[PDB]
Amino acid sequence: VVLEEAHNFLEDKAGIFYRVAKEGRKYGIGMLYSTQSPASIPMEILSQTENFLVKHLSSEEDVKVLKRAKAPFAFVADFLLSEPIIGYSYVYFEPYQPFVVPLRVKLLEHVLKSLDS
Amino acid sequence: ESPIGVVVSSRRNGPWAELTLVLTPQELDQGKRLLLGELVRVSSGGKDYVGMVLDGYYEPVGRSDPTYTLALAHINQVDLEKEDPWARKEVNFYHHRIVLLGRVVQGGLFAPSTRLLPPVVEARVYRMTEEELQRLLAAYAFGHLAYGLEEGGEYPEVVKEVDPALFVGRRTANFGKTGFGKSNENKVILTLLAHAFPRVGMLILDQNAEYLLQTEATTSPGLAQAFKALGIRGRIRFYTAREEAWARRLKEHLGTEWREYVEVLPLKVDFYHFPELAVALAYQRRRLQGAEPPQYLENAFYNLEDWKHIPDRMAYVYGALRKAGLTPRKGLKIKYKNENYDISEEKSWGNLQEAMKGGARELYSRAKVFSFLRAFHAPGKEANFLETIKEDLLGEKTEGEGKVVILDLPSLGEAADFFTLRLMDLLFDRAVELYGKRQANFLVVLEEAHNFLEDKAGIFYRVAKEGRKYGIGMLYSTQSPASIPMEILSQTENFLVKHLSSEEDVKVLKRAKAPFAFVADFLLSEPIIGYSYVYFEPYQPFVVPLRVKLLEHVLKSLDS
Amino acid sequence: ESPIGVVVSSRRNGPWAELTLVLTPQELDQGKRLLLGELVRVSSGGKDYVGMVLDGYYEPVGRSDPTYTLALAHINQVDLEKEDPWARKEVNFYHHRIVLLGRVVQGGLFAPSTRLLPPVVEARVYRMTEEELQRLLAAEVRTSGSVKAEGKRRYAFGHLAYGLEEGGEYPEVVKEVDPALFVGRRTANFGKTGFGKSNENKVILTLLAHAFPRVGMLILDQNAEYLLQTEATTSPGLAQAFKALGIRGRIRFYTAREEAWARRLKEHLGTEWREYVEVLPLKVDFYHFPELAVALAYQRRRLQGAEPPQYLENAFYNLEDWKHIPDRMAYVYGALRKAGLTPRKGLKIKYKNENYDISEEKSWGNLQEAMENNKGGARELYSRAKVFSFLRAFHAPGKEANFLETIKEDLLGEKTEGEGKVVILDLPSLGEAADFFTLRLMDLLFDRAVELYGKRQANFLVVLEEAHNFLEDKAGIFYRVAKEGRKYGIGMLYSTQSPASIPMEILSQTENFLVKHLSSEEDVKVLKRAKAPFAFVADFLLSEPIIGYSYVYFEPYQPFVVPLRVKLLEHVLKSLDS
Amino acid sequence: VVLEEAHNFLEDKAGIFYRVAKEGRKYGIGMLYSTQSPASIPMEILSQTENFLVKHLSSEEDVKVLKRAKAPFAFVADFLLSEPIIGYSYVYFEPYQPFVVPLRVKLLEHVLKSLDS
DNA sequence: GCCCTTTTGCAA
DNA sequence: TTGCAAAAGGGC
Numbered sequence A, D: 001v002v003l004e005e006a007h008n009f010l011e012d013k014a015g016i017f018y019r020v021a022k023e024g025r026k027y028g029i030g031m032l033y034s035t036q037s038p039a040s041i042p043m044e045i046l047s048q049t050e051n052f053l054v055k056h057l058s059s060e061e062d063v064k065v066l067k068r069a070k071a072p073f074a075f076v077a078d079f080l081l082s083e084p085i086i087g088y089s090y091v092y093f094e095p096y097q098p099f100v101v102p103l104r105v106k107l108l109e110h111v112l113k114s115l116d117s
Numbered sequence B: 001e002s003p004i005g006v007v008v009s010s011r012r013n014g015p016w017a018e019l020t021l022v023l024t025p026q027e028l029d030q031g032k033r034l035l036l037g038e039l040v041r042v043s044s045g046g047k048d049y050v051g052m053v054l055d056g057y058y059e060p061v062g063r064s065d066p067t068y069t070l071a072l073a074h075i076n077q078v079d080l081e082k083e084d085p086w087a088r089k090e091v092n093f094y095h096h097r098i099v100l101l102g103r104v105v106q107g108g109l110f111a112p113s114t115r116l117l118p119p120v121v122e123a124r125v126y127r128m129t130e131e132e133l134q135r136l137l138a139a140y141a142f143g144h145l146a147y148g149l150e151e152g153g154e155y156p157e158v159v160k161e162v163d164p165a166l167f168v169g170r171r172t173a174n175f176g177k178t179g180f181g182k183s184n185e186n187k188v189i190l191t192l193l194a195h196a197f198p199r200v201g202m203l204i205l206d207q208n209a210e211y212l213l214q215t216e217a218t219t220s221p222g223l224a225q226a227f228k229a230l231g232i233r234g235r236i237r238f239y240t241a242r243e244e245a246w247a248r249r250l251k252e253h254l255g256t257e258w259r260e261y262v263e264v265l266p267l268k269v270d271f272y273h274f275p276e277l278a279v280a281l282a283y284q285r286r287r288l289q290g291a292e293p294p295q296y297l298e299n300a301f302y303n304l305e306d307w308k309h310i311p312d313r314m315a316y317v318y319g320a321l322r323k324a325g326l327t328p329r330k331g332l333k334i335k336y337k338n339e340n341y342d343i344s345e346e347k348s349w350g351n352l353q354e355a356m357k358g359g360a361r362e363l364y365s366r367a368k369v370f371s372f373l374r375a376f377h378a379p380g381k382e383a384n385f386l387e388t389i390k391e392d393l394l395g396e397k398t399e400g401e402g403k404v405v406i407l408d409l410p411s412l413g414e415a416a417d418f419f420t421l422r423l424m425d426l427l428f429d430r431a432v433e434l435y436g437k438r439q440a441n442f443l444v445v446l447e448e449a450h451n452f453l454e455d456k457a458g459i460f461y462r463v464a465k466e467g468r469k470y471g472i473g474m475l476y477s478t479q480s481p482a483s484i485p486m487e488i489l490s491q492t493e494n495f496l497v498k499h500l501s502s503e504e505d506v507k508v509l510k511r512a513k514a515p516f517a518f519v520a521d522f523l524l525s526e527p528i529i530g531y532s533y534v535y536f537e538p539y540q541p542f543v544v545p546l547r548v549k550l551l552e553h554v555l556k557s558l559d560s
Numbered sequence C: 001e002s003p004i005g006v007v008v009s010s011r012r013n014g015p016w017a018e019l020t021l022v023l024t025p026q027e028l029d030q031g032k033r034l035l036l037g038e039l040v041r042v043s044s045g046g047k048d049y050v051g052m053v054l055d056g057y058y059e060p061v062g063r064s065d066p067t068y069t070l071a072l073a074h075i076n077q078v079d080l081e082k083e084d085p086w087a088r089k090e091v092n093f094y095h096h097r098i099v100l101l102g103r104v105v106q107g108g109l110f111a112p113s114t115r116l117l118p119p120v121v122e123a124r125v126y127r128m129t130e131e132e133l134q135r136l137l138a139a140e141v142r143t144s145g146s147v148k149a150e151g152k153r154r155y156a157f158g159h160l161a162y163g164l165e166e167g168g169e170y171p172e173v174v175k176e177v178d179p180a181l182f183v184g185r186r187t188a189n190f191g192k193t194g195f196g197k198s199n200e201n202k203v204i205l206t207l208l209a210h211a212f213p214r215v216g217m218l219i220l221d222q223n224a225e226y227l228l229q230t231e232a233t234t235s236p237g238l239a240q241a242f243k244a245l246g247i248r249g250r251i252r253f254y255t256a257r258e259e260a261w262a263r264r265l266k267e268h269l270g271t272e273w274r275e276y277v278e279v280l281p282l283k284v285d286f287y288h289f290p291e292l293a294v295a296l297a298y299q300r301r302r303l304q305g306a307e308p309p310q311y312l313e314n315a316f317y318n319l320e321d322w323k324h325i326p327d328r329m330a331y332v333y334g335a336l337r338k339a340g341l342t343p344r345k346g347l348k349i350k351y352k353n354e355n356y357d358i359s360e361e362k363s364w365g366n367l368q369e370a371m372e373n374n375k376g377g378a379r380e381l382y383s384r385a386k387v388f389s390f391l392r393a394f395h396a397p398g399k400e401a402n403f404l405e406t407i408k409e410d411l412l413g414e415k416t417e418g419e420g421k422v423v424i425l426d427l428p429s430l431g432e433a434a435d436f437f438t439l440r441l442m443d444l445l446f447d448r449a450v451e452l453y454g455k456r457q458a459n460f461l462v463v464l465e466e467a468h469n470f471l472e473d474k475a476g477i478f479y480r481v482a483k484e485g486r487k488y489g490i491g492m493l494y495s496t497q498s499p500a501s502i503p504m505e506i507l508s509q510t511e512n513f514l515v516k517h518l519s520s521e522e523d524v525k526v527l528k529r530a531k532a533p534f535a536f537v538a539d540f541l542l543s544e545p546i547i548g549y550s551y552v553y554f555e556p557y558q559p560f561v562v563p564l565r566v567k568l569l570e571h572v573l574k575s576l577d578s
Numbered sequence E: 001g002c003c004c005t006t007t008t009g010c011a012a
Numbered sequence F: 001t002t003g004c005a006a007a008a009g010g011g012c
C-alpha cells in the first residue's frame, strides 16, 4: 500500500489505517508512506515502522521525534540538521541491518538507462 | 568460589543502594569479566543479597597517566603483552557499578531493597552458580535465562516453569513490537498449561484466525495442530459461523480423524425457539449503547415470561419477529384469535397480517428494532450458543475436565464487538452467582487489548478489576504499553515485555513498575526476536531476562 | 550512653538543618551502624534535638588512596581483618547525613525545626533508648507555656519499626491513639490491595465501637469483608469482634440473600447470633409504598434530565391526597399490576363499592372490565402504567420494610438517639442498581442531617471503598459530604488505592493519613505535594513493598510521620478483653 | 464585610461576593476574608489585597501562590512551610511597608486590659 | 459529542 | 386537539 501525504490518511475514527498498519504483517500487507515531516505521524504508528529513509530535515523537533521513535537515529541528527544535500538518504532496515547507513539515491532516468540493457 | 573483584565504594543512590567494583589486571588477564545486566551475589555482614551489574567504565587507578603511557608505547611500536609487562600491569584496570535489589528470607519471600549500607572493607562479590539461579527462579520449561546474544551468557539449564498459581486468578501483560514473539509465547503458555494441568479452562477471543489453524510461515502452528501432536483429545470447542469451510480446513490438515481433537459448533440460533433470547439481546444492545432503553422494550423484557401463556400475545411477538425479517422454517403455525396460520407462506402471512394488547402490539408495530438480529438467525438451530458456552466453561458437571473455547470473531462481521461484550457480561454474572459454591478456574485470553480496556465502565475493565476474587484470570497483549490505562497497568501482577522502540513505551513501563527502570536501555537498544523480560509477583519481584522457546521445539521435546 | 560518631559539619539545606556524621573504624568494627530513617538524639549546647538518618555514602578521610590500597591488598590475598590492621584503619570509614526535626521542650511540647545551626565541635550524636522513643512518640504541639490536656483513655495502635531490617523493630515502643481523632474527621487510607487496609479499618472501627458507644456507622460494604471473616483468611469480622467484646444489638445488616447470610452467621457465631445481628431485606414491596414507586419513576426522568410528564408530576405531588380516595387508589394499584409487579396472595382492591382480589387472574380481569367501563390523573396513570415496568427488579411481595426509610430512622432517630446502630449495606447483592441506591440513600441522609441542624448532630461515620470512583464528581453528593460533613458531625473514612485520582481539595483538607506501599510515581508525588511531612518516606514507599507496613500521620498537632507495624485485630481484641 | 471561609464565595467570577471584592473600594466597602488556603482564591483577588496575616501553611502550592502574589514573602516561605507554631503570624500591610515582620499577635484579653488606660 | 427539532402514531 | 413515546436529522 503506497500513500503519499500519509498525514492525511493516518487519522480517523475506528482507525481503518491504524488496523492496517498494526495487523497487516500476518497477511503480507505492507505499507510505504511519505509524510515529509515525522512530527505529523502519530507515535502509535511511528513505533511500528521497521524501515526508514530520511532525507535532510531542517527543523529540530522533527529530528528529536525521529530519535525518540527510533534510537539509532541519534547519531545522524546533526548531519541531517547541518547538511542540506539533495538525494542523500539514511536507510535503516530491521532486523537485517539494524543501523543507519548513508546513501546516494539514483535518478530514475539513470536507473532506466542502466537497466535497459 | 572466589570474589570476582574488590569493592571500593558504596552509597545510597536515590531509593537503591549501590557499590563500585574494581577488576585488577591479574583477573582481567585470567579472562574474568562481568556482563551488563548480570545477576551477582553480594555478601555483607553474613547476609547474601542479589545485585545486578548496571554500568561499566575505565578510570585510572593510582598515580598514572594511561593516555601518555599507551600513546608512547604505540609510537615506539612495542608489543604491550610481551615486551613491557610492567607498563601493561598498571593500566589494565576497570570499574563496575552494582545495585542491590534485595535479599531472600524465610520461605523464598523477597525482602526488597535494604536500609543498611555496607562498608567497603567487608563487602564481597561472588559470581552466582546455576544452583543459586535455579533456586532464585523457582522460589515443562517456558524459557531459559540468557544475557543478550553474548556467548557464555546463556544458561540452558536455568528455566522458568508454568504453574496455574502464576496465571489463573491473576492478570498478565504481554507487550512488545510487531513480530517479536507475543503470540508464540501465548501459545507456548497455553499448550504447556493444557498438557500439564487439565483442570484449567480457557476462553480465547480469537481476532485474527490464528489460534486454531495456522499454516502460513508467518507465525507458530495453531492450537489444534499442537494438541494433535501432543495427543490431547476432545478438549477444543470451536464456535464459528463458517462451519463448512472450517470443517474442510480441519479435514485437510488434521487428517481424517480430526473430529477427536476439534469439535465445531455454529454461532447461529433460531430465534423462533428463544423469543426471550431475542428480546433480551435487543434490550441489552441499547443499554450497552448510550443508556435508557425504551419503556416498551423494558416491559417486554420483564414480562415475556408471563406473555408465554397467552397465545394472542405470543402471536403478536412472532409476527413482530417475522416482520423484522427473520425467516422461519417450513411449516410454522400461529394461533391467533381461534385460527392457525402458516407464516412461512406468503398468503398465510398476509392473511394473519390483515387479521392483526398489554404490550405486544407496540412491539409488533416497532418491528424494525429486531433487524440487527438477522446477523445471528438461522432457522432450525435451537442451540443457544451463549448458554452452551456457559455450561462449557462454568458448568457444574465439570469440577475439572479442561475445556478450551475458541471464538471465530471475524466470521461474525460487525456484530463481534456486541457479541463479545454480551458474552463476557453473562459469564461474569454467572461467576458472581456461583461464588461460595465453586470457583470458575479459567483464563481469558485477550488480544489487541487496547480495544477493550479503554472505557472504565466496560465489562472487560470490571473483569480486570474484580476477577481475582472469583478466580477469573486474564492474559492480554497490546503491542504498546502506552495504550493501556495506568489504573490497569499498576494493578497488573505479571509482565512479559519484548523489544520496545518508543521512549514513551519504556517511560510508561518504568512509571508503572519501578523495577523495570534497569532494563530500559536494553529494551531500547536491542531488537532481538524471542527475548523476554519476565516479572512475576510476589515471589520474583525483579526483572529476569529469558529466551522464549518455539512452539515446534516445545512439541518435539514434550513428545518424549 | 556515648556518642555514635564525630560530627564534621552542619548547614541549613532548604527549610531544614542538617549535619554530617562520620563513623570511625573502631566503631565500625564493633558492629555499630545506622539505618536509613532511624531516629537519633542530637545534643548541641545543652539542648536535645531529634534526628533522622537520611543518607549514607563512602568518602576518603585524610590523605589516602583507598582504591589503590584495596586493590593492592586484594591482589596479594591479604585478609583485611586479622593481617593488616593499619591498612584496615586507614580506609575503614563511612559518612552519614542527619536532619534535625525539632526538640521536645517543656512538658511534652514540641518545637518544630530550629533557628540555631549547631557548631561542629560541640555537637554530639547519641543513640536513643526505648523510654526516650516512647516519650518522643507521646509528644505533640501545644500553644505555649501550657500544661498538657491529660485527655481520655488511649489504646495501642502499633509499634515502631524501620522496615524488614533485623534489629529495626521496637515492640515495646507503641503508638497510642485516642479514637476521638476518627470522630467527625475525614480520614484517608491509601495503599495497594491486600496490604493490611482491611485490618487497620477493622481495628479503627472496633476502637470507635468500644470507646464511643454513642456513634453510628454507615458501612458501604462493597467487598463483603466487614461482617464476617472471608473464606480466604482467619481474621475475624466486625460481627465476631463485637461478639468477643460483648456488644449486643448494634448491627443491622441490609442484604438480599438473608437466608444464606443467616446460615453463615449461625455457622460462624453459634445459635444466639440473633442477639447481635438483625438481618433485614433490601427488596421493597411497592404495593405498600406507592409514594416511593411514583417518586422513583418520576425522578428517573429528572436524573436523565428533560421535563418530566405532567401526569407523573401531579401524581407524585398528590398521591397523599389520593390515598383518601379508593376510587383513585384502585387506579394506582391497577397501574402497578399492569406494569407487572406481583402482588401478595390475598390482596383486595375496592373499586366503587365492589371488592376485588387482584391476586387472582379472573378477579383481575373483572376489575379491568369495571375500570375500563377523569378522576384526577388516576386514569392517565392506569393508561401509561407501562412506565412502571423497570420496578420489577426491586419488587418482592410481603416486605413492608422501605429500607430507605428504615436506615434514616436508625441513623437519625430521636427515639433512637444513643447507642448508634452499625448499619452495614451488602452492596454486591443489588446487581447494577447498587450505585443508584447508594447515591439516593446518601442524598436523603445528608438532607435529613442538614435539616436536623441545631436540634442534634448526626453523629455517625461513613465508610467508603474505591473513593476515587465517588469523589471524582465535583457536584456529587459524596464530594459535598467530603467538603461539609464535619459541620454536621458526619465523618468519613475512604480507601482509594490511588491518591492521584482524589481531588487536591480533599487531599489537602484531610486530617488523618495511613499510607501503605504505593507502586506508582504519580501517587507518591501527589501525596508529597498534598502534605509536606511525607517528603522523607517517598523513596521507601516507592521501593519497599512490605505487607502490614504503614506510615501514620494524624493532623493537626503531630510533629512528624511515624512508621508503624499495625497490631492485629486478634491481639487488639485480646487486649481489650482484659 | 467579615467573610469566613471565603474560598466558597470568591470562587465564582460572576458572584456578588467576587463583585464586592473587586469593586467595593470605590463605594467605601471593605472586606476581611479568612480562607486557610490561598491556592483556591483567584489570583485577580490575591494580587489586589492590601493587608496580609499569614500563619502556618502546609502546602507548597499555597506557598507558591503566596510568593507569586507578593514578592517579599520569599524570605519567609521556608519558615512558613517548616514551622507549625500557634499564634505566630507574618504581617505585611501594603503599600508602604519595607519588609515582612513576624509577630506574636497580642491576646484579646491583654488588648482589652490595656485599652482601659 | 453533545444538545435540541421535526415527524409519526396512539392515546383520549 | 392534546399529551406522550420513540426514532432520526441539525447546530454548537
Ligand SMILES: Nc1ncnc2c1ncn2[C@@H]1O[C@H](COP(=O)(O)OP(=O)(O)NP(=O)(O)O)[C@@H](O)[C@H]1O
Pocket (backbone or CB within 6 Å): A022, A023, A025, B176, B177, B178, B179, B180, B181, B182, B183, B184, B185, B217, B218, B219, B220, B479, B529, B530, B531, B547, B548, B549, B550
Ligand atoms: N522465541 C522465538 N524464537 C524464534 N523465532 C521466534 C520466536 N518467537 C517468535 N518467533 C518468530 O517471529 C515471527 C513472529 O511470530 P509471532 O509470535 O506471531 O509474533 P507476534 O508478536 O505475535 N506478531 P504480532 O501479533 O503482530 O505482535 C514468526 O516468524 C515466529 O516464528
